[PDB]
Design a protein around this ligand. Structure first.
Ligand SMILES: Cc1[nH]c2ccccc2c(=O)c1O
Ligand SMILES: [K+]
Ligand SMILES: [K+]
Length: 274
């Protein structure tokens, strides 16, 4: 799966990215990582989609197999980076698929690219409501140079949700091991700022200039009150749908890749039929 890893200069930065360069009919599937991890989170999903689609995964500034400190940037800049990679690659039409807070990039990308280029989106496990106290606390911890690691640990607890989930544990404990405070502290500032300025992922989506089909596929939070704000949002908005995947962790791309794949294919086929 590292047979597909590339690197390129993007404005000021060398960014790594996955591209299987599959010669096939569009749309390209653009898999967008959350904060302080990289394309490795997608290694099982990429396998599900490899045969039939062109699959691109950009890594954000300072992210990759060798993380590095970089100057401060936000989702605005993640969006420009992603488009610049698509331009360099000649990719025209694409279906963006995001993980968690990679969603802020996805929804701004939909605005920027417009519905012709980006006609649909799939958002995975992304907190739809404004920060509850435990999560609000997590962010404040991430921002703290003394307590960022404690922040990440509390988040790992929430994400694993009491499961001995060997693939996810490996991703959190090994694949994110090289990320430091420069990343984690930034993710805290950006995510906090994102909800502050946009209200919520739902408010930001509802506010798109040109709304279009978006599906939220998620395994957590598992409580019925969270399902309820998804169903209420979907009752109000013909373009919004959701699917509870019932996977153990915050990482359906890792733990139920075959289920995440089928929703991606469904949206990719709807696009092919216009
Ligand atoms: C990979 C990743 N990174 C984060 C960093 C800060 C806050 C939330 C997250 C998150 O939800 C997620 O999935
Ligand atoms: K187990
Ligand atoms: K709906």
């Amino acid at each position: 799966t590292d047979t597909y890893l590339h690197e390129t200069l993007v404005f000021d930065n060398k960014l790594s990215y996955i591209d299987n360069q599959r010669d096939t009919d569009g749309p390209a599937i653009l898999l967008l990582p959350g904060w302080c991890h990289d394309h490795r989170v997608y290694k099982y999903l990429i396998q599900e989609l490899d045969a039939d689609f062109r699959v691109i995964v950009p890594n954000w500034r300072g992210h990759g197999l060798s993380p590095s400190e970089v100057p401060d940037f936000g989702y605005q800049e993640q969006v420009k980076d992603a488009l610049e990679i698509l331009d360099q690659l000649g990719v025209e039409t694409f279906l963006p698929v995001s993980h968690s807070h990679g969603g802020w990039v996805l929804v701004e990308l939909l605005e920027q690219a417009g519905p012709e280029r980006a006609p649909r989106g799939i958002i995975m496990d992304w907190l739809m409501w404004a920060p509850k106290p435990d999560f609000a606390k997590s962010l404040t911890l991430l921002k703290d140079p003394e307590r960022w690691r404690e922040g990440t640990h509390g988040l790992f607890d929430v994400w694993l949700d009491g499961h001995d989930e060997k693939r996810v544990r490996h991703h959190l404990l090994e694949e994110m091991a090289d990320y430091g405070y420069d990343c984690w502290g930034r993710s805290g500032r950006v995510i906090e700022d994102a909800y502050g300025r946009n209200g919520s992922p739902m408010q930001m989506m509802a506010n798109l200039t040109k709304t279009r089909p978006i599906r939220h596929i998620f395994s957590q939070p598992t409580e019925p009150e969270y399902e309820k704000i998804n169903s209420d949002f979907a009752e109000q908005h013909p373009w919004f749908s959701y699917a509870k995947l019932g996977g153990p962790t915050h990482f359906p791309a890792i733990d139920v890749p075959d289920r995440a794949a089928v929703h991606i294919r469904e949206f990719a086929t709807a696009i092919r039929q216009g």
